[PDB]
Amino acid sequence: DDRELAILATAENLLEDRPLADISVDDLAKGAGISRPTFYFYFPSKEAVLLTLLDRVVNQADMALQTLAENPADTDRENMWRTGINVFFETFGSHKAVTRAGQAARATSVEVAELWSTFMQKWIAYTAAVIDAERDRGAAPRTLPAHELATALNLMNERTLFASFAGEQPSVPEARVLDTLVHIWVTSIYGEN
Amino acid sequence: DDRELAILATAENLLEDRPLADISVDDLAKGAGISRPTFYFYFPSKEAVLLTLLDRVVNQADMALQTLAENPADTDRENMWRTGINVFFETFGSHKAVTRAGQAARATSVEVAELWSTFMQKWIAYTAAVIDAERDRGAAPRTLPAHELATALNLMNERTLFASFAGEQPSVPEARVLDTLVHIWVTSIYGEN
Ligand SMILES: Cc1cccc(CC(=O)NCc2cc(O)n3nc(C4CCOCC4)cc3n2)c1
Ligand SMILES: Cc1cccc(CC(=O)NCc2cc(O)n3nc(C4CCOCC4)cc3n2)c1
């Protein structure tokens, strides 16, 4: 456990500086102060190490969103959506290396693709349930199917946050991405059509 | 040229059935009715073949959008945005195998990442110029910076169309994705805040 956490911290450090393809099991064992065979006790592969790093970051974001859902919802509609989107901005934004490599690996790894898909379904279904509540209370108009709207807005957040964090071209500057997403969620949820 | 087009058609056919990683230069030469060394005359690699397939599809979408921009803009604002988004829905939707492999390769290939980035900058800048025109004429309110709004809506279309075409979970059904994107573009462009 000592040593497991030591391997994980070494992988997150090395991913800040190069891809997983460029990090060797030997690099990971060296950093964690264990032998290579001792590494293979804790993790079947460097790929299994990334999968565990991603699982921790995804669960941290999920647990923060549940925390927010526990307490009452803000009496200001725009602020209620900003606070929830900010959970993802801060959590993944605090773990950009893990995030970047995580997204790369989804094309590679069925396990990584499956983890990402399970969490996105959970977050889309929660988004859809809040839009349905807003429509029930008379605050939001009955336009698009709620689940479809929730799907597109969640995919937009995924691609846009990732582009900002990786500093891709094109991308919204990190300092502008929360305002930009909140504007699009609010106008599309409350907007008549 | 005969033979180049024959290699390209074979690669698009084989990509419908498996990834590029699972297609051999020998597979491509076999399909096009040439020898392996004759293949290496036309293309340095199977990767170079994908890059050429993607370039043709991207240019087809770009040339269709220029066609639409040539003719006057529809007197119905919602229809003007649907027609333009539909260019991307139909073009990439007619070449799903190339699209799917194209997106996979961006993590792999600097050349593929660079081609995709050049076209997205062009499409975002055109989107931003139409929003600016709409604001100038008094039709759209001056909310978010136009280029930032254009960036987020274009990234949303990228991730959402690709998820629908690859049938990922989660995804908007292909039969619902155009209505869903148009709703979000229109409410976010014309929506007061
Ligand atoms: C309050 C409230 C009420 C209702 C719903 C929410 C949830 C919310 O608002 N946003 C959800 C959300 C969902 C996602 O699937 N993602 N995915 C990302 C990517 C993760 C890391 O790569 C880049 C971004 C962000 C994100 N956000 C909140
Ligand atoms: C009329 C008018 C006035 C102003 C602007 C437009 C342009 C428009 O409306 N949409 C642009 C647009 C841009 C993109 O960068 N993409 N990227 C995709 C992905 C391509 C293949 O992978 C999945 C989708 C679609 C797309 N669309 C049109």
**Cβ–Cβ gap A183/B171 under 8 Å:** no
Nearest to B158 by CA among B119, B111, B105, B110: B119
Does residue A170 have a cis bond before it (omega within 30 degrees)? yes
Query: At A68, which amino acid appears?
Result: L
Spatial contact of B28 and B45, defined as CB atoms under 8 Å apart: no
Measured between beta carbons, the chain B residues lying within 8 angstroms of A142 are none
Residue of chain B whose Cα is closest to the Cα of A145:
B180
Query: At B43, which amino acid appears?
Result: F
CA distances, B127 to each of A176, B123, B146 (Å): 18, 6, 8
At A83, list the tokens. 């606070």
Task: Please give the Cα distance from B11 to B55 (Å, whole number).
Answer: 14
Residue to mutate among A160, A168, A176, with most B CBs inside 10 A, is: A160
At A104, list the tokens. 């790369």
**DSSP H or E segment with residue B82:** helix B77-93
**Cβ–Cβ gap B152/A180 under 8 Å:** yes
**Cβ–Cβ gap A149/B183 under 8 Å:** yes
Ligand 2, closest atom to CA B131?
4
A79's CB contacts (< 8 A; 6+ apart) are none
User: Touching check for B183 and chain A: CB below 8 Å?
Assistant: yes
Of A149, A180, A191, the CB nearest to B148: A180
For residue A9, the tally of other CB atoms under 10 A from its CB is: 13
| Half-sphere exposure at residue A143, Cβ-oriented, CA atoms within 13 angstroms | 24
Interface of A with B in 61-120 (CB under 8 A): 78, 104, 107, 117, 120
Spatial contact of B160 and B177, defined as CB atoms under 8 Å apart: yes
Task: Please give the Cα distance from A153 to B180 (Å, whole number).
Answer: 10
B181 dihedral zone (left: phi>0; alpha: psi -120 to 50; beta): alpha
User: Touching check for B124 and chain A: CB below 8 Å?
Assistant: yes
B132's CB contacts (< 8 A; 6+ apart) are B146
Task: Please give the Cα distance from A185 to A179 (Å, whole number).
Answer: 10
**Cβ–Cβ gap A181/B121 under 8 Å:** no
Task: Please give the Cα distance from B79 to B182 (Å, whole number).
Answer: 9
Does residue A37 have a cis bond before it (omega within 30 degrees)? no
Q: Which ligand is nearest to the CA of B120?
A: 2
Question: Is the CB of B160 within 6 Å of ligand 2?
Answer: no
Question: DSSP string spanning A80-124?
Answer: HHHHHHHHHHHHHHT-HHHHHHHHHHHHH-HHHHHHHHHHHHHHH
User: Touching check for A154 and chain B: CB below 8 Å?
Assistant: yes
Chain centroid to Cα A43, Å, comes to 23
Nearest to B12 by CA among B55, B44, B73: B55
B13's CB contacts (< 8 A; 6+ apart) are B31
CA distances, A30 to each of A7, A10, A37 (Å): 9, 9, 12
Task: Please give the Cα distance from B40 to A25 (Å, whole number).
Answer: 36
At B77, list the tokens. 């604002």
The domains located in chain A, with CATH, are: 1-45 (1.10.10.60), 46-193 (1.10.357.10)
Spatial contact of A20 and A65, defined as CB atoms under 8 Å apart: no
Minimal CA separation from B34 to chain A, in Å: 31
